[PDB]
């Protein structure tokens, strides 16, 4: 028949990380339903309980047509197949405690053996409140709410900043340009609006962006930021760095400060706020590096 | 030393599809942005106007790094590119109107006539993803056969028949609290029609029918497979609706246990319980399509 055997992943990460290994002891092949195997795409194929109680699937779940012969992988007489998934991003396993994970076994043409772990939790009073999506794994849950805690900060010192006017300011000159009393009012309204978001507003971070660039949002739709791999590539602090990059995708929101992305990088932002200044008040990079203000 | 020029592409549909040719007009080449040409990836790149009154952008905006040379296009002199778009999924183009649309006042304006999508849903109905207005007005038509059959479904489930066909079918044998179990499920779907704030998105291009998060109510991500769905019937755009609504742990908490007819069947002959907690088993029952 079909061997199976569920285990535990080593690694110096909150995640959790599950290997499973099936093989066809039997003497003919069998024919194993391919959604029903872990791989990459959400199927919710684990039964989770934290101290003995279910933990419900987040994933997505999905209406296919009656599976054909395509939809089958072969394991021949004696083959066998091993693959890891990650089960945090699909469970929500933030909150501490023992939990129990079991493999559903995948239908042919029934659970594997149970794993028990240790989960330290996300020791987090947010989880003005931050909320997940998009399979983001305990690491990168806690990797999120770090990075937040320094988007506070920094946010926090713009907002210090803009309080007393500088007409002679280099900082603003820098990423907003030339001085009126009415442009400083308008980045200082842009900045606590932005720092009221992080810190009293309900926040959303998804982690299912695959696609090269930083982060995305629909300014439309409050509080929920898409994180990009360049996300993860980006340092804590610094410039184009995870806590500055939060400003930025903040400040596109309307009910935030209503940015517009009419440039990128540092030297398109200076270009800008010589330019035009209006059009660097408009702009979320220009927020971010004054924000971030790393030499 | 760029001329941009517009055009509207001619086409059976309410899709709002243009042309922009970029012809570089002077004596040297000059680098283009592609993230600036209407593609595939969001950017507010066009400014819309409905009768003279502005229109909101409904795409995504997007941190990119400093432009690289991976992304830049160089347009030599005299040469031209010519790019296609289609503006109603990234602006709200729902209201009927004349609309103006002007690549960005870069190029010139060019002015059509929308009909527009039923209003009056907008309980309510929202759109993301870049959902044409072909294809709100296709969904809202669906929605509203997803109302008939759920409620005729609902209808049917007032009144316990123990020997009753339909309910056999698709939810196996009667008891009492199974029965019950029906009614709360498809009373809740009902409800998730008539008077909860909908989502639908249209970015899903796998396969398959639809797919939800069962604990993000009420947002349904429409794939290739509803596209290709008939409004009414056997695995329809209205059943899909059905099936999709009824895994919000919300609406019914429904699992995808089993996919298909054949499969719904003897999946309530065996295991009514587990029926009863089947997305198309759902479906089937309100689609009731022999
Ligand atoms: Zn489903
Ligand atoms: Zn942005």
Not at 86 to 106: F, K, N, T
Not at 107 to 123: D, F, Q
Not at 230 to 239: D, E, Q, R
Not at 286 to 291: I, K, L, P, Q
Request: with cysteine; net charge negative; glycine share 6%.
């Amino acid at each position: 028949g079909l061997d199976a055997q569920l285990t535990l992943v080593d690694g110096s990460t909150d995640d959790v990380r599950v290997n499973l290994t099936l093989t066809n002891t039997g003497d003919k092949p069998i024919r194993l339903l391919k959604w029903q195997l872990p791989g990459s795409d959400d199927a919710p194929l684990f039964l989770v309980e934290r101290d003995g109680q279910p933990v419900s699937y987040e994933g997505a779940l999905i209406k296919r047509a009656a599976p054909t012969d395509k939809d089958f992988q072969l394991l021949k007489a004696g083959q066998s197949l091993t693959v890891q998934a990650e089960v945090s991003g699909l469970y929500d396993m933030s909150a501490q405690g023992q939990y129990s994970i079991r493999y559903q076994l995948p239908a042919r043409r029934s659970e594997s053996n149970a794993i028990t772990l240790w989960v330290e939790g996300v020791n987090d009073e947010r989880v003005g409140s931050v909320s997940f999506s998009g399979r983001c794994t305990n690491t990168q849950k806690s990797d999120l709410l770090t990075a937040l805690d320094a988007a506070s900060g920094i946010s926090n010192n713009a907002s210090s900043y803009l309080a007393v006017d500088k007409p002679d300011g280099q900082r603003y000159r820098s990423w907003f340009g030339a001085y009126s009393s009415a442009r400083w009012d308008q980045a200082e309204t842009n900045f606590s609006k932005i720092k009221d978001a992080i810190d009293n507003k309900p926040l959303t971070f998804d982690c299912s962006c695959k696609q090269s660039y930083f982060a995305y949002v629909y300014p439309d739709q409050p509080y929920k930021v898409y994180l990009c791999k360049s996300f993860w590539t980006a340092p804590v602090t610094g410039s184009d760095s995870r806590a500055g990059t939060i400003v930025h995708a903040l400040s596109h929101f309307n009910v935030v400060a209503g940015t517009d992305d009419l440039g990128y990088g540092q030297a398109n932002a200076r270009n800008l706020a010589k330019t035009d200044p209006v059009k660097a008040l408009n702009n979320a990079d220009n927020h971010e590096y004054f924000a971030e203000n790393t030499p």
